[PDB]
């Protein structure tokens, strides 16, 4: 009730990025680049925003934080840099 929120310490979630998180982080970032959002990584002549959203994940210059909700309501804010990309 009083904000719940599990801190950045003591977290029971997978340190790896879930395929749904990857697709949401890419889909939204590609949408934002398409909506003229400023690009953080050095562009290599990329005409497609998903080609960029994918390249932004390589250097990890995405400033997004994932609120992963548990079944009891409580959530863990995982920064895209913390989440490892094995998949």
């Amino acid at each position: 009730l009083k904000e719940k929120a599990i801190p950045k310490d003591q977290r029971a979630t997978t340190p790896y990025m879930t395929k749904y998180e990857r697709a949401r982080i890419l889909g939204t970032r590609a949408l934002q680049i398409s909506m003229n959002a400023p690009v953080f990584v050095d562009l290599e002549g990329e005409t497609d925003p998903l080609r960029i959203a994918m390249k932004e994940l390589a250097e990890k210059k995405i400033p997004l934080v994932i609120r992963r909700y548990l079944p009891d309501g409580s959530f863990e804010d995982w920064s895209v840099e913390e989440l490892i990309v094995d998949l």
Partner: protein, 97 residues
Amino acid sequence: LRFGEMERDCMIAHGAASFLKERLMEASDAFRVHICGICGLMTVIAKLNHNQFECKGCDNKIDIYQIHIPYAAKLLFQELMAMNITPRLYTDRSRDF
């Protein structure tokens, strides 16, 4: 083309919650309506120029919330309203669970 139950069930299976939501709103119904936050009903008289948003039965022009929902849902809640059923669309969480 029809994006029925068979079509929806596959997009659920995949996990693509936005593509299914896109086919179910942007590519189909999609309607913006004003609802009274005090009650949860569509009783708001939305004037988008004079700004007299007043809900007849509540007096409020402040606790009113516009919402993007399918035109079929709007119609369904109005059909339920015609049979004395009140589906109070509540934007505020009150049980946590």
